[PDB]
Design a protein around this ligand. Structure first.
Ligand code: 5ID
Length: 328
């Protein structure tokens, strides 16, 4: 059954861990595996203690995230519906133990520097189970990059990449993300001038503006293969739908309105709602190195604003990608 933490995180690997993010789910650490950067997401399961305000998931409840992360990681090697826009998943393990002191040290450093909304994970007993998901290191989330983009042209590339990635996943898997807040959009520098994707056998390119965008976090996602749906049933989760202070929290209520609290159903419009949320972040909450001040540039901005006010009349990411003027 489960392996000890040291199977996954031997000493040199633990010593190189730096905490890079968190959520109610648990903790994310960056480290190195065989000279390669990775991101490790650690989720406590099956235990009785409250963790970060919630009871722990069971194996059955964590399985949908695991399945979808795997299925989406495969899209980079497919052919008819191919994209590198979703994070690569390297491995999944079930680990048993108390939290490693070295992870706690990394946890403390993050709390001392950025502040944490989580419980310090020091109360777990030596029989505690965790799921440990090791992903490719995808770069820095859009939220943390909100002051770091070159200009609105970069924003355009980012929106195009996200729309293409979601379209490819809609086509292949009838995928909805359902939680694509700006912490879940990663950016990494790339030397490639053009990025490629293939949608239903047709290959296209997108100018990178020097960034490759990776989508992460399938805790609320839904997809289906051969009529078997894998999803998060949030029909009894009342708190998901009472958040405030950010447009993000409206999106959950809107999704619920549009699917009648039936989470198994396919409503690809939910990908449009998140894209609209993201476009808003780009227009309101980002500062750019190059400004709102040349003709070529002001035109790009006018196009992003026109996209913002018209995108909600498209039925899916595929519909936006294929029919919206922003991408023509
Ligand atoms: N694979 C990755 N590469 C780089 N950063 C990652 C990941 C993953 I999984 C998560 N994160 C960072 O941790 C925060 C919480 O999920 C995210 O918002 C993000 O800051």
């Amino acid at each position: 059954g489960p392996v000890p933490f040291s199977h996954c995180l031997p000493t040199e690997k633990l010593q190189r861990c730096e905490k890079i993010g968190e959520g109610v789910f648990g903790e994310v650490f960056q480290t190195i595996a065989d000279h390669t950067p990775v991101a490790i997401k650690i989720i406590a399961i099956e235990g009785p203690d409250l963790v970060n305000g919630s009871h722990q998931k069971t194996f059955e409840e964590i399985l949908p995230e695991i399945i979808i992360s795997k299925e989406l990681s495969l899209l980079s090697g497919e052919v008819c519906n191919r994209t590198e826009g979703f994070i690569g998943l390297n491995s999944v393990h079930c680990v048993q133990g108390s939290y490693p002191p070295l992870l706690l040290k990394a946890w403390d450093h993050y709390n001392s520097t950025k502040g944490s909304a989580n419980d310090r994970p020091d109360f777990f007993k030596d029989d505690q189970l965790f799921i440990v998901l090791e992903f490719e290191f995808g770069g820095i989330d859009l939220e943390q990059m909100r002051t770091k983009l070159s200009s609105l042209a970069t924003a355009k590339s980012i929106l195009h990449q996200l729309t293409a990635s979601l379209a490819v996943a809609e086509a292949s898997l009838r995928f909805e993300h359902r939680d694509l807040h700006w912490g879940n959009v990663l950016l990494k520098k790339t030397s490639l001038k053009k990025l490629h994707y293939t949608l239903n056998g047709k290959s296209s390119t997108i100018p990178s503006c020097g960034l490759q965008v990776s989508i992460i976090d399938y805790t609320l996602s839904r997809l289906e293969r051969d009529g078997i749906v894998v999803f998060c049933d949030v029909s009894m989760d009342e708190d998901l739908f009472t958040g405030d202070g950010d447009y993000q929290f409206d999106i959950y209520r809107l999704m619920k309105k549009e699917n009648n609290n039936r989470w198994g159903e396919y409503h690809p419009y939910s990908n449009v709602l998140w894209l609209h949320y993201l476009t808003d972040k780009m227009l309101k909450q980002m500062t750019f190195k190059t400004k709102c001040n040349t003709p070529a540039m002001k035109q790009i901005k006018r196009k992003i604003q026109e996209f913002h006010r018209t995108m909600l009349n498209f039925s899916s990411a595929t519909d936006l990608l294929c029919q919206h003027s922003l991408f023509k």
